[PDB]
Amino acid sequence: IKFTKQSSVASTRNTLKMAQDAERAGMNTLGMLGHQSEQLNNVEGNLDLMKVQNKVADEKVAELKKLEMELEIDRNLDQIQQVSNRLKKMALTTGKELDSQQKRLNNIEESTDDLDINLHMNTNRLAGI
Amino acid sequence: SRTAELQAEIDDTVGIMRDNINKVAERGERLTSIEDKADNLAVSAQGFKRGANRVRKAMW
Amino acid sequence: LFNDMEELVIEQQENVDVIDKNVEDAQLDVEQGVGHTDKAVKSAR
Amino acid sequence: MSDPVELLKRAEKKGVPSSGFMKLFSGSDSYKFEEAADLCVQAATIYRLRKELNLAGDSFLKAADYQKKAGNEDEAGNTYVEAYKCFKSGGNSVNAVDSLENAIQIFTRGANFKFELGEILENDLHDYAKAIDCYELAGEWYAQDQSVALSNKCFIKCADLKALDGQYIEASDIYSKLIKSSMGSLKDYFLKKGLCQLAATDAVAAARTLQEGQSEDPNFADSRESNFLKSLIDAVNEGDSEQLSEHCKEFDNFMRLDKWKITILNKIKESIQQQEDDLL
Amino acid sequence: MSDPVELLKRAEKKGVPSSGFMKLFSGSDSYKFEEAADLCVQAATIYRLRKELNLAGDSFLKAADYQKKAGNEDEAGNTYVEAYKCFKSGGNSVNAVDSLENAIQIFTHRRGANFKFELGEILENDLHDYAKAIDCYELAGEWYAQDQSVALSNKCFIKCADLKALDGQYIEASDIYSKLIKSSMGNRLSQWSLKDYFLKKGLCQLAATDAVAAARTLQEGQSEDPNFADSRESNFLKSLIDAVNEGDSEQLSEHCKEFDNFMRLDKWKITILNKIKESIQQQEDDLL
Amino acid sequence: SDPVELLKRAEKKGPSSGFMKLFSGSDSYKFEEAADLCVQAATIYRLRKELNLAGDSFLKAADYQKKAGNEDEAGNTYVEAYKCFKSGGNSVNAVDSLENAIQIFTHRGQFRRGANFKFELGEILENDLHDYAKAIDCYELAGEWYAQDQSVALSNKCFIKCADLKALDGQYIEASDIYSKLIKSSSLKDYFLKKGLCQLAATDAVAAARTLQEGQSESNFLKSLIDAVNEGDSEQLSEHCKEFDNFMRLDKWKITILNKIKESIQQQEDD
């Protein structure tokens, strides 16, 4: 009887351990995802400012060209349950944030290509003046 | 019944995390593409700056 | 799975860094260029 | 490949401003400084190829200086960031700090680099005061950019370093700001706040922090962190350092105390033992 | 659409340098090379539209050569990268290698590292030139360490160390794993790779019959990283060291099976473990 | 403010000769003016919700910008004309709009954006016009461009839309090969199952068993089908399909292919 109960004491301590490892990993994932979200914020912002500046450059260039054991199992399960519920929250959380950032990256990237093209256009026009 | 519920929760969270692995892989793809295009944008910006300055010196 | 949620986001941190630097650099040279064309236009007239 | 030393010598020769009668016939010296900067950049690239990173950083610093003289401050900031890359790659943290300071001054992206400067000051040079300053100012710039997350990482670092440096009240205030910015890490912020308030022998403020966290955040109410902070407050009020140590071991057994918490808890225990001794 | 063959013929005709008496009356040949490169690029684009990828790559190589002759090295590197894209996508790995080598030589003269890593990938997977792939990964990771992309340096060095260990250079792979450990210490973000790095360092050392160094590596890992101390990897490495010291290959096989059941042994580990087993069995045969 | 009048003037203005060429500035400027006039009329139409007229105005615009020598802007205006024509249910001219936009995007080296719209084009060929033989071509060329861009996900999506549709057109083995390439360069269950079903629809059961076995490195229903087919029994299959319909409702594709397999059994019973 006793050997098995020791075996499950081992199983549940190790379970609580690696669950905590999942927990800490998931939070620091979310931390850097916020960090990188805000980084993509400024990427968008400079793209916006450059869009305005390329409008100005377009017009200027155009004008230029013109010009005991049971209890411990129970407690370990308690705490594993707590962590597991909370980790579920963390998984749903990461999925949502990745989704939002994915649309943001797509828009950022299209804007970058457009700005790049406009800059080659203006540079080529300026070369002929 | 508690252990089974905990298991169901863990399996669901595994599913969500596998989805996340797929999403972060797509994100890493996208970020590599964006870094390439941002390098392109930077180079084009230096080029446009220099061309405009040369147009000034040609005119003046 | 979480461990891959940690390592891959690290691999992507770098991409974010280089992107931000290159993009704002491009913005400053676009500003310099727009000013260059503004002074181009003033004396072209 | 060109010899980078010769390139630097030509950059030096071109970088001399036009003096005297010559100034009346030479055009703007800006072009000369641009060309000297380009030569220095070529020398820096060649040094980077040879893995002579400190020399490459020095060449980038010279190029950035010439760019500043040319009126191309933005090129100078970019080149200072490149000199920084060369120096912090070469293990010359001091010149890396200098390069970030010049780049940040030009940029004021500043925040990003001000945070990296704080990191160097903390880990490589152990100038914790300036690292605290760097994190605080970076976090403020982020808060101005409505960047809650980047502001938060800066204020976490600032509060941690302040608390380790004995500035418990200021660290508790920064934890209060983190709490206010995160409402709606939060459990951890409540714990740390109380801990600083216990290191300042301000037990009642810790009790208020506990009550606040219990009332405002249900997740903290039922958390191990809240129970642990309560138990610590009870021990501090009772003047029993051994009970505090027992609570620390229990919390360690279930949730590993990192180095920071250990250090704060040791100081709190030390305070308790001091009033015990002072009463004998 | 213009005939790309005719465009290449015109590019060839224009790309002739001015020789003799004509050189006194002709301006810089740079402009002729630029125009020839433009014609080559147009031919390459037309080939790419036709899915004749290898011909597009060849046209881009010609364009990059003319760009080099024109003094526009940066454009030449870009065009070598395009030639590369055409070659990799056409299944012509050799010309892709050549294109990356020219492009890297130009860029080096952060991005060079990127293309050097890609070159290492081609050498490993398509051409199976493991030695030059090792060289590419080493140099790329070195450049990334000189650029403080710690993670790219780590990815290049894990590739380099894995290839070195598979190639019998166990000591050098162990040294690279020491560097990886030293670069991964104290980061909450590399702790899992840290357990793997300790395990692979120990396995490489055991493949070198230096059980002493394996025991020291395990002790270091147990002392420096609590997560490794209690990990399955640390216990497994203990067990392998113990089997090696006992000269009991069957015990090592049992340990490998036990570790496999809980944590799948990837191919690299299987190879190195089999090498360790063979070293044990050889010592048994020699003792008898 | 009358869009009719805007288009009248856009016709009158959009190549000068004689004294007019001499006195007045460059021709491309006039073509740009006519382009802008048609854009203004098109926006008035879009606001007033005459989408077909808005898209025709954008077509006139697009032709005018490319007559000015603005290929990119022309492509953009063609996409805009497509937005109008698509939102207005006029599929034919919407397909035309994309073919011009793509034509530009392609000749202009913008393959990634080409692909994005190549796929959208294929979607309207498949869903609305039902010209599958050309939707397969679009789904194929778009995925090949995505392959060049190293954006595996989108390339895969394209080749799945290709393979599914080729399995419907009856190119069963080609579909199974596309599916194999979709397994190597990678949901992985469905690729195996679809491959086996297509291969069984070609009356090639040996390969079908092989390809499940390869899938040990859904799959059980495929055995149950390989057995129902290997013993000329279109009641075992018809029952296994009925049973699998409970824990995973069959989509249209599977129903079609499975009916083809059932028929390939019955024809073999009466031979």
Author numbering:
A (entry chain L): 433 to 499, 589 to 650
B (entry chain J): 27 to 86
C (entry chain K): 213 to 257
D (entry chain G): 1 to 108, 115 to 190, 197 to 292
E (entry chain H): 1 to 109, 114 to 292
F (entry chain I): 2 to 15, 17 to 188, 197 to 227, 237 to 290
Quote the paper:
SNARE (soluble N-ethylmaleimide-sensitive factor (NSF) attachment protein receptor) proteins drive membrane fusion at different cell compartments as their core domains zipper into a parallel four-helix bundle. After fusion, these bundles are disassembled by the AAA+ (ATPase associated with diverse cellular activities) protein Sec18/NSF and its adaptor Sec17/α-SNAP to make them available for subsequent rounds of membrane fusion. The disassembly requires multiple ATP hydrolysis events in the presence of Mg2+; as few as six ATP hydrolysis events are sufficient. The side-loading and side-release mechanism explains how Sec18/NSF can disassemble SNAREs with constrained topologies.
We chose the Sso1–Sec9–Snc1/Snc2 complex (referred to as the ySNARE complex) because each component of this complex crosslinked with high confidence to the D2 domain of Sec18 (Snc1 is highly homologous to Snc2). We prepared the y20S complex in a nonhydrolyzing condition and, after single-particle cryo-EM data collection and processing, we obtained 381,591 high-quality particles that yielded eight three-dimensional (3D) classes into which models were built. In the structures of all eight classes, Sso1 is threaded through the D1 pore of Sec18. A characteristic phenylalanine side-chain density in Sso1 is present at the same position relative to Sec18 in all classes, allowing for reliable indexing of Sso1. The nucleotide states and the arrangements of D1 around the substrate were also the same among all eight classes, with the ADP-engaged E protomer forming the top of a spiral staircase of tyrosine residues. Protomers D, B and C were all ATP bound and formed the middle of the staircase. The bottom protomer, A, formed the base of the staircase. Protomer F, with no apparent density for nucleotide in D1, was not associated with Sso1. Given that this charge distribution is replicated between each pair of D2 subdomains around the D2 surface, it is unsurprising that the Habc domain adopts multiple corresponding rotational states over the eight classes, presumably because of the flexible linker that follows it.
